Write a protein that holds these residues in place. Structure first.
Motif, PDB file in Angstrom:
ATOM      1  N   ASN A  71      26.429 -25.317 -23.801  1.00 37.14           N
ATOM      2  CA  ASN A  71      26.413 -26.413 -22.839  1.00 37.14           C
ATOM      3  C   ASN A  71      25.474 -27.506 -23.343  1.00 37.14           C
ATOM      4  O   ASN A  71      25.778 -28.699 -23.228  1.00 37.14           O
ATOM      5  N   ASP A  72      24.350 -27.120 -23.937  1.00 39.68           N
ATOM      6  CA  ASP A  72      23.405 -28.089 -24.470  1.00 39.68           C
ATOM      7  C   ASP A  72      23.954 -28.722 -25.750  1.00 39.68           C
ATOM      8  O   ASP A  72      24.732 -28.113 -26.487  1.00 39.68           O
ATOM      9  N   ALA A 109      24.150 -21.374 -22.185  1.00 43.23           N
ATOM     10  CA  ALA A 109      23.033 -22.269 -22.444  1.00 43.23           C
ATOM     11  C   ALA A 109      23.091 -22.864 -23.845  1.00 43.23           C
ATOM     12  O   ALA A 109      22.679 -24.010 -24.045  1.00 43.23           O
ATOM     13  N   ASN A 115      18.165 -20.903 -16.144  1.00 40.45           N
ATOM     14  CA  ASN A 115      19.019 -21.744 -15.310  1.00 40.45           C
ATOM     15  C   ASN A 115      20.452 -21.227 -15.274  1.00 40.45           C
ATOM     16  O   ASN A 115      21.093 -21.242 -14.218  1.00 40.45           O
ATOM     17  N   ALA A 116      20.972 -20.760 -16.413  1.00 47.68           N
ATOM     18  CA  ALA A 116      22.323 -20.204 -16.421  1.00 47.68           C
ATOM     19  C   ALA A 116      22.399 -18.868 -15.687  1.00 47.68           C
ATOM     20  O   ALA A 116      23.411 -18.580 -15.038  1.00 47.68           O
ATOM     21  N   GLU A 173      14.203 -21.539 -20.683  1.00 42.89           N
ATOM     22  CA  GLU A 173      14.486 -22.420 -19.550  1.00 42.89           C
ATOM     23  C   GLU A 173      15.981 -22.516 -19.281  1.00 42.89           C
ATOM     24  O   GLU A 173      16.437 -22.307 -18.146  1.00 42.89           O
ATOM     25  N   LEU A 174      16.759 -22.819 -20.324  1.00 41.07           N
ATOM     26  CA  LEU A 174      18.198 -22.974 -20.127  1.00 41.07           C
ATOM     27  C   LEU A 174      18.878 -21.648 -19.800  1.00 41.07           C
ATOM     28  O   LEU A 174      19.814 -21.617 -18.990  1.00 41.07           O
ATOM     29  N   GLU A 206      12.220 -23.607 -24.452  1.00 42.72           N
ATOM     30  CA  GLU A 206      13.415 -24.372 -24.105  1.00 42.72           C
ATOM     31  C   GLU A 206      14.631 -23.468 -23.929  1.00 42.72           C
ATOM     32  O   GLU A 206      15.401 -23.626 -22.962  1.00 42.72           O
ATOM     33  N   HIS A 232      25.043 -15.719 -20.356  1.00 45.19           N
ATOM     34  CA  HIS A 232      24.175 -16.837 -19.996  1.00 45.19           C
ATOM     35  C   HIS A 232      23.566 -17.504 -21.223  1.00 45.19           C
ATOM     36  O   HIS A 232      23.410 -18.730 -21.238  1.00 45.19           O
TER      37      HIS A 232
END
Lengths: 93, 79, 95, 104, 45, 79, 93, 104
Positions: free
Chosen positions: D76-77, D73, D55-56, D51-52, D48, D69
Motif C-alpha cells: 500500500n505504501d 503495509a 495500522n493494517a 507503524e504501518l 515505520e 498485514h
DNA sequence: GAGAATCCCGGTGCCGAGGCCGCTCAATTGGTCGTAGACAGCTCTAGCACCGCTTAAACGCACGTACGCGCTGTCCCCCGCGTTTTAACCGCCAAGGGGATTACTCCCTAG
DNA sequence: TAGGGAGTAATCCCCTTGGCGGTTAAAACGCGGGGGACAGCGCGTACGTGCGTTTAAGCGGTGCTAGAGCTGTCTACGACCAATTGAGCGGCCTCGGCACCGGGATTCTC
C-alpha cells in the motif's frame, strides 16, 4: 546462543501499539528485513570506502550510502534522525 | 528549446536502430520524458558519488560505477 | 442461477481474497525429488525447503499471470494464448 | 557502567552492530559514529514498518500481526514498495486488483 | 629556510609553550597573553 | 506421470489468483515447462550449495541463498 | 602509476593468433571484463566462506564459484584447466 | 623463476594474489586460490581472444575492432547470457530482421 | 528497362600499434609460530517409509456462447523528397581551476 | 597504549572551459499520397459452466536410523618480517593497416 533481534522490535512495537502481538512467521519477516538492510547498507559503505583509497569506514560514508539506498523522503528522514542520534552521542558531556 | 536539443532525426535514427519501420507522429513527448528520467537518475547518482569524493566535476569513473550500481554496466571507460 | 461471468468474478475475488497454498504437496515433493536425483542421487530434503520452493513458484507463477494478462489486454483480447506467454517471457528478459 | 544505546537515546544495540561490522570484513578500520548511525537508521525503518503493520492489523479488526498485514503495509505504501520491489514475501498474498474492462 | 607555519598551528605551539611554562612553574600567573585578551561569552540570552 | 503430477485445476487456481478470466487449453503444458525449468535453475544452485556443505540433506539455507542470488530473495524462511 | 594487464594478453594473443592487432579501446574493454570476472568470483568466494562457517579461502570455495556463477560447459572446461594447473603447481614442490 | 612459470602460465599469480589480499575479502587466504583464479582467468581470456580472432578473420581485417568482438559475444550463447546485463563500446547491435517486416 | 545505390578495387595519406629502453617497487625467497582446519568421536534431531481411510479434488464429459480470428471499408497519418534554415563540427589558443602529489603533525582506533 | 591512517597546507601542471569564425551536413517545413490503424462484421470453434465418476491428496501413527551438529585433539597451513632483483610501467619512436577517397561494377526496385 542463537542471536536475533526479537526483543528490540518487541519494545518499539510496544511504545506505539500496546495491545498487539506478533506471529512467529512475521517475527522472522522483521528479522530477515533488518538483516537484509544491514547487509545492503554495509556493503555499499564498504564499496564507497574502497572508492577513495580510504581504509576507514566512518559516519560520512554511511550517510552517503543511506542517501544512495533509500528513496528520497525516507532518505531525508533517516539522515535527520541519524544526525540527531550522532549529535546526542557525541555531546556526552 | 531547452529539451529541444534532441530532435526528430535523432529519435528517428534511434527508432530505426530499434529495427522499427513505422513510427507515430506524436511519440515525441514520452520518449523525451523517459530520456529525462534516465539522465536525472544517472547524474543524481554521479553527483552523489562525486560529492563524497570532494570532486566538484563529474568524471567518467563516477558515471560508469553509477551504471554498475544501476545494473547497466559499461565497458571501456574504466572499471 | 447466474449469467456466465458473475460467478467467475466471485471465485476470482475469493482466490485473491485468501492466502492458502494452491499446489498439492505430495506431487510437488515427488517432482522435487525426481528433478533433483539427476544432479545428485540419494538426496535428503528439508520440509521448509519444500515450503520455500512452494512459495517461490507460487509468487513466480502469479506474477507471470499478471504480465501475461497484461499481454492479453494489450492484444485487445480476454483469453491468454501461448504467444502472450512467449511475449511476457521475452519482455521479462529471459529465454 | 551504562550502554551506549541509552547514551545515544536508542533501543537497538550499538555494540552488537559494532561487532557485526567488525569481523564482517567490510574494512579493517571502523569509526565510532558508524554503529550509532546504522542503529538510528534501523530504528527509523523498523518503527515505520511497525507503524504501518499495526495500522493494517487494526484495520483488519484483529489483535495480532499476521503477514497479510505486512504485505498490505508493504504494497500500500509507495516508497516502501520501491525499496522492497524485489523481495518475495512469506504467506502474504496479493493485493486485490481487477482491470477496468473485465467489469461488464 | 623556514617551514610555512600557518595560522592554525601558531596558536597550537603558543598555548603548548604556555602550558609547558605553567607546568614547569607549578612544579606563575599570566598577565597578558593571546588567550586572556579573548572576550568572554555574554551573560544575556 | 510426475511432470503433470501437479494438475490443471491447480493451475487454474493459481491463474485466478493472478487475475485472468479466460485461459486456453494449450497453456497447461507450457506452464509446466516454465515451472520445470524454474526449479531446475533453483536446485542446481541448491545442490551445488549442499555439495559444498559436505551434507546430503538440502536445508532451508541452501535454497534461500539460491533464490537470493537470482534476484528473487524470500523472507521468513531465512531464520 | 596506472595498473593494467597489457603484456600478458599481448603474448597470449601472439601465441594464439600471431597476425592480429589490438586497438586500445579493445585493450580497455577486456581489462574491464577481466576485472569484472575477478570481482565476481572473489566476492562469491568471500560470501561463501563467510557464510559457510569458515575463516580461510581455499581451492574449494573458488571451484564452487567457477562451477556456480557461469554456464556449465565452459565452467567444467575451466575446472579441468585449473585443476590441471594446480596439480602442475603442486607437482613442482 | 616466477610461480607462473612454475605452474606454466603467462598471467601474474603474485599480482592477482596481492590484489585479492588487499581487498579485505578474507583475513587468511590459501595458496591454491591465486593459481586457480589465474588459471580460470587465463582460460577465459584465451577463449574471448579466440572468439575475437575468428570474428576478425571473416570480416577481412587483421585488426580486432570492438564491433567484431561484439558480434563474437552476441553470436555465442554462453558468453551471451554470461554478459547479458553489460553493454559495450561503439559496437552497435547484430543485424536481424523479423519476417513480417520483410514484405512480399 | 531506367535509376539509384550499395559493393568492389586501386591509390593514398596518416596516426595509433607495436617494439624498445630506463628503472622502481613489488614478487620471491626464507624462517617463526599462533592457530584455523582436519579429523576422529559422539548425541540425538529429524528425515525417510509406510499401513490405511475420508473425501476433496481431479478427471471426464456434455452443452453452448462469449470470443478468437479472418474479412473489409474507410479515414488518415506518417513516408519520401525537395528546399531552406540553422547550429554542429572543427581548428585552436588560452586562463586557470582544481586534482595529483608531497610533506608532516596528530587524533583516532586496533589490541 | 601506542602505531598509523587520516587531516591539512603547499604546490606542480593537466585538462577543461570560452570563444572568435567558417563550413555544410544536418535539421525544419511543407506537401502529395498510399499502405496501414482501426471500427465493424460474421463463421465457428475452442473453452466456460455444470454435473457424475474416479484417485490418490492429506493424516497421522510410528519405527529406523542418517547424518546434522557439537567437542576434543593434533597439526600443517598461512600470516608476518626481511632481503632483494627483474618484471612491468612510463616514455619514445618507425611504420603499416585501416581511415579516406574516387572510379566504376553491380544489383535491388518500380
Amino acid at each position: 546462543r542463537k542471536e536475533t533481534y526479537s526483543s528490540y522490535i518487541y519494545k518499539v512495537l510496544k511504545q506505539t501499539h500496546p495491545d498487539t502481538g506478533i506471529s512467529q512467521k512475521s517475527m522472522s519477516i522483521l528479522n530477515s528485513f533488518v538483516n537484509d538492510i544491514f547487509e545492503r547498507i554495509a556493503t555499499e559503505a564498504s564499496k564507497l570506502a574502497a572508492y577513495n583509497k580510504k581504509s576507514t569506514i566512518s559516519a560520512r560514508e554511511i550517510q552517503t550510502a543511506v542517501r544512495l539506498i533509500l528513496p528520497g523522503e525516507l532518505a531525508k528522514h533517516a539522515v535527520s534522525e541519524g544526525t540527531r542520534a550522532v549529535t546526542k552521542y557525541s555531546s556526552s558531556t | 528549446d531547452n529539451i529541444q536539443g534532441i530532435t526528430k532525426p535523432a529519435i528517428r535514427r534511434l527508432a530505426r536502430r530499434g529495427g522499427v519501420k513505422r513510427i507515430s507522429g506524436l511519440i515525441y513527448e514520452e520518449t523525451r520524458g523517459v530520456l529525462k528520467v534516465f539522465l536525472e537518475n544517472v547524474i543524481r547518482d554521479a553527483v552523489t558519488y562525486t560529492e563524497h569524493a570532494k570532486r566538484k566535476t563529474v568524471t567518467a569513473m563516477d558515471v560508469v560505477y553509477a551504471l554498475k550500481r544501476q545494473g547497466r554496466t559499461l565497458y571501456g571507460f574504466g572499471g | 442461477r447466474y449469467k456466465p461471468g458473475t460467478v467467475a468474478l466471485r471465485e476470482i475475488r475469493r482466490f485473491q481474497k485468501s492466502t492458502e497454498l494452491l499446489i498439492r504437496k505430495l506431487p510437488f515433493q515427488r517432482l522435487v525429488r525426481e528433478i533433483a536425483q539427476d544432479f545428485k542421487t540419494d538426496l535428503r530434503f528439508q520440509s521448509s525447503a519444500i515450503g520455500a520452493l512452494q512459495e517461490s513458484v507460487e509468487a513466480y507463477l502469479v506474477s507471470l499471470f499478471e504480465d501475461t494478462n497484461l499481454a492479453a489486454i494489450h492484444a485487445k483480447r480476454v483469453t491468454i494464448q501461448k504467444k502472450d506467454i512467449k511475449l511476457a517471457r521475452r519482455l521479462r528478459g529471459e529465454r | 557502567s551504562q550502554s551506549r544505546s541509552a547514551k545515544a537515546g536508542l533501543t537497538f544495540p550499538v555494540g552488537r552492530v559494532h561487532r557485526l561490522l567488525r569481523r564482517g570484513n567490510y574494512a579493517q578500520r571502523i569509526g565510532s559514529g558508524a554503529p550509532v548511525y546504522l542503529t538510528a537508521v534501523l530504528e527509523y525503518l523498523a518503527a515505520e514498518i511497525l507503524e504501518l503493520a499495526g495500522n493494517a492489523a487494526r484495520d483488519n479488526k484483529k489483535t495480532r500481526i499476521i503477514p497479510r498485514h505486512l504485505q498490505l503495509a508493504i504494497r500500500n505504501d509507495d516508497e516502501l514498495n520501491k525499496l522492497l520491489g524485489n523481495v518475495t514475501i512469506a504467506q502474504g498474498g496479493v493485493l486485490p486488483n481487477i482491470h477496468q474492462n473485465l467489469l461488464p | 629556510t623556514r617551514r610555512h607555519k600557518s595560522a592554525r598551528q601558531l596558536i597550537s605551539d603558543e598555548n603548548k609553550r604556555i602550558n609547558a611554562l605553567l607546568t614547569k612553574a607549578n612544579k606563575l600567573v599570566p598577565k597578558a597573553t593571546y588567550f586572556s585578551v579573548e572576550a568572554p561569552p555574554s551573560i544575556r540570552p
